[PDB]
DNA sequence: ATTGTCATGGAATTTCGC
DNA sequence: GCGAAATTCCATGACACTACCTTCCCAGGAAACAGGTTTCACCAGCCAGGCCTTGAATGCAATTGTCTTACTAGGAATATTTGGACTTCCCCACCTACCATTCAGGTAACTTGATACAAACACAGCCC
């Protein structure tokens, strides 16, 4: 906490013996381990190598009742990635802030 | 905020020797990497049978011959008066002590 | 399984000629009540060690490392068997 | 700085069964040391019991074991029920 | 399984001191067992000379002091300098 | 990729015990928690020179007795023919030995 | 002085073709 | 308007700190072991005769045990003087934890090789 106080951390507790409270870290700890479990049958669970994938193939998965990418909505255009859209290329950079 | 109230565990065996100091002797004496909860527990009884036992017997000997407070001779004689006690510290000196009275009936005066 | 009258098993010549390597000349006949006794005691001094071993691993059968590991204990080691 | 020590605990074994009894200092020593030697005894027979049978774990009935060797005859007979006593007693609380 | 040993480190010995010399498989043995307990008896004299002054370190000092502590005499004066030689040799390798 | 030549740490010290294999057995014998770089080295050379001296003396005894081969009779008399390699092995018995030829010299025959 | 969630496949729904 | 196709919907489940522990199975093989038969040779049990060693009785000699005195050194108390063990604080090198790579050893096999044992005739050493 006292590290904390540092930054301008406002730190927040769930209620305690209830997982619940904490919403989504709980549903991408089940995002984590159905990437890392997908990528790592059939081989010894050499996970370490594999986290900078995780970081960018969870980050690049498109929302599916939201229809975006976290890209998208944390920074407003895709980096160089495989399958990125051109349809925002259209656009002036300089107005789509505001969109 | 504030926790339960804490019951040491040697009040939760009945014991007096501690079970928390046992149970720190060890995993910093490197007798094995893992310690299971109850093997502190066990040891710490039969830490304390035997210095009962010593005790009940030195506790005699000081009534015997009128002591208030255990000298290490009666510990001395509380030790090699009893059979099986002994055969334990078979090879051990106490400190302290002389050794019992006896006389092999050989060089009885004549 | 019970079979008496084995400590009767140590012989008078066998006494006899565990005494020769001793280096001993002439013995008395009183020594094989000595004997037996004093050999007795020392097996149920290593037997009463080695079974509380092969007790502890749950095992039925007191192997060859379990006696050395009992003659390890009271400071008579044994050499040749292991341990 | 500190050093440990078994001299209290004494005292409340020494007053269960000789209530009106005093011990010197220098016979507190004694089954001071009498501890710590009776100690690493059964935790070093217990110890060499781990290599022995492969596991890194002192259980409870490793020290059991450690006791049956170290201790002769009639204490042997004891001290095990005089543990299981303190462990059964144990284990049903908490 | 596998049972390690100090057989096939004995051959290397004897064929440098008695190069036309067999050794039988009994009197291999004892020959691996004086091993296995002269190990132990200066590792587990090393080791309490751990605790004695409150190291967590098995130093190549103090498996000197555990051999001038189980050999005696002529043999204390041999072994201690048959290892320091071992010992330079090896650390200006490297 | 391939690597460098493995030189074995027995062969970087000129002794024929390992040190790969002792160094397993101090971190696997809970001796202590960490084990030096030197320790196994210097604790193979103590273990080269005694079963040198054991063979060195063995080889005699095989010799002075006419064999190719050392059968543990000659290990039990080289031992207790040498008199700091007794004080060694003080309690041991060998397997297989028996003991030296002794007589105290007033069991000869009159 | 705090609170689920959200990827996911039938299945229902809407588009829409002409 | 039917069908095909493009789309939105919503009910749901799993993530929450995890490994042991027990008892039975499987299993292959092997471990010998416990069980048992078989036979031959040998070691143990049997008993007595002769001799030597032990026990006892003994007389005596010096060895040893006690008494007494002059005394030397031990211990304790002192001051002090001196010699150090451990607590302290800090930094670096060394050990470890790790994976990948490779080498060596253990098991294993087939062969080879060499020695020890068993047997026979004789020699030498010691004793009656």
Redesign the interface.
Do not use: C, W
């Given at each position: 906490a006292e590290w904390a106080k540092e930054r301008g951390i406002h730190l927040e507790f769930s209620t305690p013996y209830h997982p619940q409270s904490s919403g989504k870290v709980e549903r991408k700890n089940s995002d984590i381990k159905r990437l890392l479990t997908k990528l790592l049958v059939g081989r010894p669970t050499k996970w370490y190598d594999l986290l900078p994938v995780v970081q960018l193939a969870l980050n690049n998965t498109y929302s599916p009742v939201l229809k975006y990418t976290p890209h998208q909505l944390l920074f407003g255009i895709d980096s160089n990635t495989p399958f990125a859209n051109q349809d925002t290329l259209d656009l002036t950079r300089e107005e789509e802030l505001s969109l | 905020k504030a926790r339960a109230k804490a019951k040491t565990?040697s009040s939760?065996?009945?014991?007096?020797?501690?079970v928390g100091?046992?149970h720190r002797?060890?995993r910093k004496?490197?007798?094995?990497?893992?310690?299971?909860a109850?093997?502190p527990?066990?040891?710490?009884?039969?830490?304390?049978?035997?210095?009962?036992?010593?005790?009940?017997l030195?506790?005699n000997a000081?009534?015997d011959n009128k002591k208030?407070?255990?000298?290490?001779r009666?510990?001395q004689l509380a030790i090699r008066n009893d059979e099986?006690?002994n055969?334990?510290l078979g090879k051990v000196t106490?400190?302290?002590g002389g050794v019992l009275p006896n006389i092999q009936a050989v060089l009885l005066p004549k | 399984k019970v079979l008496r009258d084995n400590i009767q098993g140590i012989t008078k010549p066998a006494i006899r000629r565990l005494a020769r390597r001793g280096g001993v000349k002439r013995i008395s006949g009183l020594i094989y009540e000595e004997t037996r006794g004093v050999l007795k005691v020392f097996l149920e001094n290593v037997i009463r060690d080695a079974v509380t071993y092969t007790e502890h691993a749950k095992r039925k059968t007191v192997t060859a490392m379990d006696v050395v590991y009992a003659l390890k204990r009271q400071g008579r080691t044994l050499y040749g068997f292991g341990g | 700085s500190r050093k440990?020590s078994?001299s209290v605990?004494?005292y409340?074994?020494?007053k269960?069964?000789?209530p009106?009894?005093?011990?010197?200092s220098?016979?507190m020593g004694?089954?001071n040391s009498?501890?710590n030697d009776?100690?690493?005894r059964?935790?070093?027979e217990?110890?060499r019991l781990?290599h022995y049978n492969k596991?890194?774990?002192?259980?409870?009935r490793?020290?059991?074991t450690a006791?049956r060797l170290?201790?002769?005859?009639?204490?042997a007979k004891?001290?095990v029920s005089?543990?299981?006593?303190?462990?059964t007693?144990?284990?049903s609380?908490?």
């Open positions: - | 565990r939760r065996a009945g014991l007096q020797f501690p100091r046992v002797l060890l004496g490197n007798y094995a990497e893992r310690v299971g109850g093997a527990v066990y040891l710490a009884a039969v830490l304390e049978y035997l210095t009962a036992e010593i005790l009940e030195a506790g000081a009534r208030t407070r255990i000298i290490p009666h510990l099986e006690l055969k334990l106490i400190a302290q | - | 440990e078994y605990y004494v409340k074994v020494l269960q069964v000789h009106d009894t005093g011990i010197s220098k016979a004694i089954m009498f501890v009776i100690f690493e059964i935790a070093g217990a110890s781990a596991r890194s774990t002192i259980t409870s490793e020290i059991q006791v170290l201790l002769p005859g009639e204490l004891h001290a005089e543990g299981t006593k303190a462990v007693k144990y284990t609380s908490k």
